[PDB]
Amino acid sequence: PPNNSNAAEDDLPTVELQGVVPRGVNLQEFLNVTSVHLFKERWDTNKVDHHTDKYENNKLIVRRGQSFYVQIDFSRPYDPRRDLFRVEYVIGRYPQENKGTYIPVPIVSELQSGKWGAKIVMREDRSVRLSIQSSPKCIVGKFRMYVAVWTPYGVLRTSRNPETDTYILFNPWCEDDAVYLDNEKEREEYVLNDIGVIFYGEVNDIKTRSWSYGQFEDGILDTCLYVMDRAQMDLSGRGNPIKVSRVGSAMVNAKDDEGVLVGSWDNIYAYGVPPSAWTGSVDILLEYRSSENPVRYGQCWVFAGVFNTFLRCLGIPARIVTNYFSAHDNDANLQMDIFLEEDGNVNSKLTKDSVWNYHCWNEAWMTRPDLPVGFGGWQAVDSTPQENSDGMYRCGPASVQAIKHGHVCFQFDAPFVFAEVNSDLIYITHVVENVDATHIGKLIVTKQIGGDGMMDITDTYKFQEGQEEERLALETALMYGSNVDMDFEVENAVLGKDFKLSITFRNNSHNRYTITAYLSANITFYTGVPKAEFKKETFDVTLEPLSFKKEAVLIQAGEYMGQLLEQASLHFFVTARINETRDVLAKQKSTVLTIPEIIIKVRGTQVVGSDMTVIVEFTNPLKETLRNVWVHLDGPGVTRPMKKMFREIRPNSTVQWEEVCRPWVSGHRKLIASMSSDSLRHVYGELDVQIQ
């Protein structure tokens, strides 16, 4: 039976006896809890370090995948030779461990990475202070807390106590979290700011509207949970910000599901609040929660305002974007069909598509493990009812990076959003009279970080009008919805050297073809979040009949070496158009760079004030010879920096460098090595060393 309500709860036994326990059993031997403390005040380290001290809620609020302190008082001092207890977190009326809705938390010696556990960190009289760690994939919601003491007769569990109810939120600060956001200023703006600016008007007359998102005000966090309860969203999926943002897309509007806001553009607004009267999200959500009915009325920016609150409250970083000249496709063919009468006026009966002076929606920040690497980061989500998506008015999450390159096959609703920002306007009388390729999506903006100014983010959705890539990506989007095969492969790509990209064409027909193509090379985070485009090329190629043809693209090291991070990979888009037939061939692939190694060993005792030897070893990883190889050794507490030069290292050859050091700062110190030569450059090795 579906466990789809956070507000529902089950009764957990306090004296969970098993079998036929004899009368006169003496449970006095076993621990019992006299008191639980969560250090939940808003000045204390839990809420401050978890960035939850702004919520008005007086319960404990923490973010998943991060440690917090509790303290349990027992009737006598806890003694691990006779006592065994655990903490339990429970959510919903039908909790199950294999669905993540019953969470046992064992008392462990050492916390383990990414795993629920609790560690005893202090013991005074009858109490124990616990450091509890939650999983970074934890369900987001309000949990009941219990202490369970194990006995030969069964479990003895604390009573239901609403004061230890605990909220667990998404964690933009935890790097194992799907919503990790490694930039503090962006976390401050997209999570913790409860005031925003929404842009509207027209392109050459841009207006601004203040908005009180208010995600921290009393009752708002509870309402967001009630929204998911109202959607009948399974609890076990609520730790996935893809499901949470797609549920929110549907539930912020009233269609289909009794959601928050009734939309209206009829200029009368009978029996309700007219859309331009609202100045924030709180009165809408609080009225929705107390009335338990949709609130009248809203328009696009009100939908986006309330959606933004829902997302930021739960801890998904989010922002509102404004699109000027926004197309609403009604027949999913990805272009604006505008039918004119012979007279010249727009035939309003045949014309079902429309474009608006502006339209607002949301972007939600998350990894996309359901898509290939390179498509995480900003995802477009829209709660304004426009078109049905799989039977309901909802939209997204659609990867903004997938939209840019027109890979609209990736879920969710990427074709529709692409048509909102870059559809062609097709004027039809049935003789096609004109095409306007530049009008839709003239400008896309969002509030700048740390000010009320406008940030132009058009280039994230689309290439610049007039460039060949804007056409090729649109023809890609259309094809997704000549007897030529296209593939590409990247030849032996080693970190720190140039490499070649090999695009091959096979023409199996008897025809000569002309091809026009572009290439986009990008650096991506290990989790699949895009970081930046570092190379972009358009090229033309002629294709002789019955032929194979390879086009070699050199990627110089200087083009990418400045924008790398740990475990970062490369993401390539290639799109070719066969000009004679308008056929388009698109591919995207990722690769991981081969990483040359630098082993650092140390020989001798590592004590402040006696000499020890560092051994830096390096192997030439190439089938070529390396010249003027400078090796460097940095060791802040261990050595002043030092260099060795090698005039030549032959292929697959190994050099060794021995260096005498004498540390002067005791503790946890570190050694770092670097290698640069004429070809391979800026390769590193590292070693942690303990110095006495």
Partner: peptide, 7 residues
């Protein structure tokens, strides 16, 4: 105001 400007 938010209005249709074509169609």
């Amino acid at each position: 105001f938010x209005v249709k400007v074509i169609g």
